[PDB]
Amino acid sequence: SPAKKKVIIIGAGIAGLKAASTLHQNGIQDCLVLEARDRVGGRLQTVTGYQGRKYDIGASWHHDTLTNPLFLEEAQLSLNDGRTRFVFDDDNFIYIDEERGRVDHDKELLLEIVDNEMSKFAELEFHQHLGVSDCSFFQLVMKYLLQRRQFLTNDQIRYLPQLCRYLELWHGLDWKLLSAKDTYFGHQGRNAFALNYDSVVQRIAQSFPQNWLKLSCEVKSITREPSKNVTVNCEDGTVYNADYVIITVPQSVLNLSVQPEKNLRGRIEFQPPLKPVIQDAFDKIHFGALGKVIFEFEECCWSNESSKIVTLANSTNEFVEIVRNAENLDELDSMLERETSVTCWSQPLFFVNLSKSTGVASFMMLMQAPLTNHIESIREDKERLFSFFQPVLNKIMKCLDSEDVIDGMRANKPVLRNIIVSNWTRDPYSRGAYSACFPGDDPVDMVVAMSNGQDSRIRFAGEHTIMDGAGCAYGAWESGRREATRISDLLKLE
Amino acid sequence: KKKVIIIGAGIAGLKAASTLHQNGIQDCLVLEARDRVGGRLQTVTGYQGRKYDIGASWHHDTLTNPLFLEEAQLSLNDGRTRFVFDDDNFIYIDEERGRVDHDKELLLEIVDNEMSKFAELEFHQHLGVSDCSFFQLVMKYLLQRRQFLTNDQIRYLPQLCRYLELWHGLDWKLLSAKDTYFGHQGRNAFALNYDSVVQRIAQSFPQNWLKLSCEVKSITREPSKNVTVNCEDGTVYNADYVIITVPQSVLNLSVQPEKNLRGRIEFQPPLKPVIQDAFDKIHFGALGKVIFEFEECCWSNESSKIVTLANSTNEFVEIVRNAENLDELDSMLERETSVTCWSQPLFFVNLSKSTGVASFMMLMQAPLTNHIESIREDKERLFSFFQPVLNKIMKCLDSEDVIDGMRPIENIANANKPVLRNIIVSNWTRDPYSRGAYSACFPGDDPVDMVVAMSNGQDSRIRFAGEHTIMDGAGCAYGAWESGRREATRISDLLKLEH
Ligand SMILES: Cc1cc2nc3c(=O)[nH]c(=O)nc-3n(C[C@H](O)[C@H](O)[C@H](O)COP(=O)(O)OP(=O)(O)OC[C@H]3O[C@@H](n4cnc5c(N)ncnc54)[C@H](O)[C@@H]3O)c2cc1C
Ligand SMILES: Cc1cc2nc3c(=O)[nH]c(=O)nc-3n(C[C@H](O)[C@H](O)[C@H](O)COP(=O)(O)OP(=O)(O)OC[C@H]3O[C@@H](n4cnc5c(N)ncnc54)[C@H](O)[C@@H]3O)c2cc1C
């Protein structure tokens, strides 16, 4: 009964899609790509909004364009057909405080400058020196303020910590949940806003046999018969046999495997269960929750000075006073515990003014955990969403020379037509955005256990399974290429 | 006759004396060729009593700079102001285009940042695979990334990124690519009187130790147990240990012919190969300074850091687009003079915003430096040479063209126009006791070598100190300061532990 297959890939995200592509390109046939959703792409998904406008609600950028192999590949194509597949949209950040207004490039505040000194401080804090304890990003910032208070103005002490939190939008984590050791990292060059990551997804998906793709099939278990064979079971009853399998489900979905209860959507029952090294790696790495909100307006009636805008959370002069009077990190903690609801100003938010970079009168906004989890939970209540983001949307329009926003969801004033929201934390085949470090996490344990496979036949691919480009679309891509190559060679020696 | 002999009263030599004294060492003296202390640290006085550091000006790497932290503690204790954090957002000016900084369409700072990453990736974990000139490195980048750069970015980015010339005091075709990018361990603090630092240390040991105008010309280390030193005037001192702090450039004369060169010291026996071979790894740049003193501030204090970019050409762009490789671009870059204020980048510190003084402190680099210090006394010519960039700057700062008021001919209808009252220029390249600014790398150079050679010393008795004898803070005031405490400590114990 079990139909024979050379290789069976679980998940049609970019890792799985590139693993299949690699296999076909290497002359391997009789393979399959099992995907639980009714589409390919995984965390790469482009959606349609007001008037046919398109937005990437998952990944949006090609990072590290200096080294990024996926980007380079895409750039080569565009060098021939002259087609526009991406656009370099890095720009000078505009920072907005609710009270003070724009604080970027300010001749008195000089925030970007002290931020740079802070990064250096963090680097001098962990780089080189072995054995330093980890601690949260927030605690790292307080330590910086404490040690350098003699060289900072009251305004810098107040607004710097809030401006530094834009890093929260790189991890999808609040600074008190984020590992200080993982916060900073060098970007290998400018980023490139993909103009349809779906275009990248379809190009790869289409580079191999289409009857290889099986959508809407949710894998529920994988068994290794200690006799060169692997049994896979789709929920739709079908059973398969294969020499090899490449598992590319999110680290969060795979986690479900090391816990009791098998009736969880997306969970895969492994027999034998995943090795202890893999099991144990889950206690040393976690998952962040970066989310997106697409604010679509009728037309562009605001300044297009920049395509990057960050709204700072609220700060107070009281905080400055506490920093001035604290004797040590211990007292600052005590004094800081000063005693109410969560508003659009309770945390930083990162806005992408697509008007300037793509010409579309819309804003792409990034949010972090825990806000992401609350906002996605009420993803349906548009009225409530507008109320929540109304004050910061207004403050932006002010700073960008415009009037308060008008709710046109059902000539001189910005009219909001639609609001789109990500759903990654509530989606069972997602359960979050991507791998992230809580203080104490060592991503290396997971990368090592994943790339060494459960055994010779059961392998892993995905953004959480590799070092360079970890968490990125291109890293997931490379991992796909990594596992398919190892298998092509092995089979090649058949 | 003496226990320790310190040659040079720069900050390296003065710290070394301060230390020895701090460890109760007796009978030590400081021999300085000049008629003052401070070496490359010199604060001069100009119009209306304004003071300027014509040598070192900033405390670099304030996060780790131990000299700076010491000054900071002093300030915490007495409230006296010893420095100010003058880092600021740079204003970049092009003769034709005007301001090109923080531009919504040019975004030069962002690509310059990428430019920096690329440089790290090229020399990263490769053992520094064959260095080239900063200029060459920049061309590689332009070529390899042209597909992702606009025409104007290709034109102005190379010019803007040359601000790095003012950090080395070397033009981009003479500068080592591998050493072009530095750490910058935190903000910089402008010393509000480095003379305060020099004075403090000079006053921390026996005032009778110092001997000014004493040019040392020969250091003889007899296989016995004492060293012999003789100033040019004839006086000969002999001591247990000797800490030589003269600048690398001067020390590099000991390995040349003709002991008639001013400053050159004759070693007996000669400097071992290791040391002499160290000088083969280039070194010594020529950062220079010009101070423009105005009657009063009549320009906008938008920033305290202004950089005028050297002229560029669209013709250059066209060539980057065409070249098919590094060799074709290299040769396709053949344009067949005259040096003007626009032939190189110039760095202007607008002291009005940071220190409330109506002056500009301008930094220049080799080969321009030597030419400008050559005519330092020709005020009229100095004015004509920089007049165009000065006006270009004043225009951008919402002011008028400069008026020459250096002579006793003041006017009354010039209250809205900036009035230049005086110009002050350095003389480091032409001063025999400095012969340049400080250690620097020509492509192919390797500082580690001279550092180890100097650090190791000629022997347990003939030691070295100075901004070229250390790794952390190399070429900086604090590096020289530390190197001084270093040799001091060693010699200290070798004497304290004895009897
Ligand atoms: C909001 C957001 C923004 C992001 N922005 C960026 C960015 O700007 N740049 C960047 O580089 N990265 C970004 N990322 C990360 C990037 O999207 C991911 O690294 C990458 O898409 C992960 O790819 P993958 O192939 O490993 O996994 P997917 O996460 O691609 O997983 C593969 C597939 O497994 C399927 N699957 C799960 N369970 C089962 C099952 N039981 N049976 C069958 N199939 C199953 C899933 O449905 C999924 O399609 C972002 C992520 C999010 C969530
Ligand atoms: C234009 C300029 C700008 C600078 N800006 C900065 C800055 O912003 N920040 C910073 O950290 N550094 C700066 N520096 C560098 C800083 O000035 C030096 O690192 C430091 O002063 C070197 O100190 P030193 O003690 O090693 O040498 P000096 O160079 O201090 O040398 C010591 C002494 O040796 C004496 N000497 C030489 N030959 C003989 C001889 N034969 N006999 C007796 N005595 C002799 C000299 O006259 C001199 O006084 C700058 C330098 C220049 C030229």
From Swiss-Prot, chain A:
Keywords: FAD, Flavoprotein, Oxidoreductase. GO terms for biological process: pantothenate biosynthetic process; spermine catabolic process. Its EC number is 1.5.3.17. SUPFAM superfamilies: FAD-linked reductases, C-terminal domain, FAD/NAD(P)-binding domain. GO terms for cellular component: cytoplasm. It comes from the Eukaryota. It is an enzyme of class 1 (oxidoreductase). Its cofactor is FAD. It catalyses: spermine + O2 + H2O = 3-aminopropanal + spermidine + H2O2; spermidine + O2 + H2O = 3-aminopropanal + putrescine + H2O2; N(1)-acetylspermine + O2 + H2O = 3-acetamidopropanal + spermidine + H2O2; N(1)-acetylspermidine + O2 + H2O = 3-acetamidopropanal + putrescine + H2O2. InterPro entries: Amino_oxidase, FAD/NAD-bd_sf, Flavin_monoamine_oxidase. Binds 1 FAD per subunit. GO terms for molecular function: N(1)-acetylpolyamine oxidase (3-acetamidopropanal-forming) activity; N8-acetylspermidine:oxygen oxidoreductase (propane-1,3-diamine-forming) activity; oxidoreductase activity; polyamine oxidase activity; spermine oxidase activity. Present with 6960 molecules/cell in log phase SD medium. Belongs to the flavin monoamine oxidase family. Involved in the production of beta-alanine, a precursor of pantothenic acid. Multicopy suppressor of fenpropimorph resistance. This is Polyamine oxidase FMS1. It comes from Saccharomyces cerevisiae (strain ATCC 204508 / S288c) (Baker's yeast). The gene is FMS1.
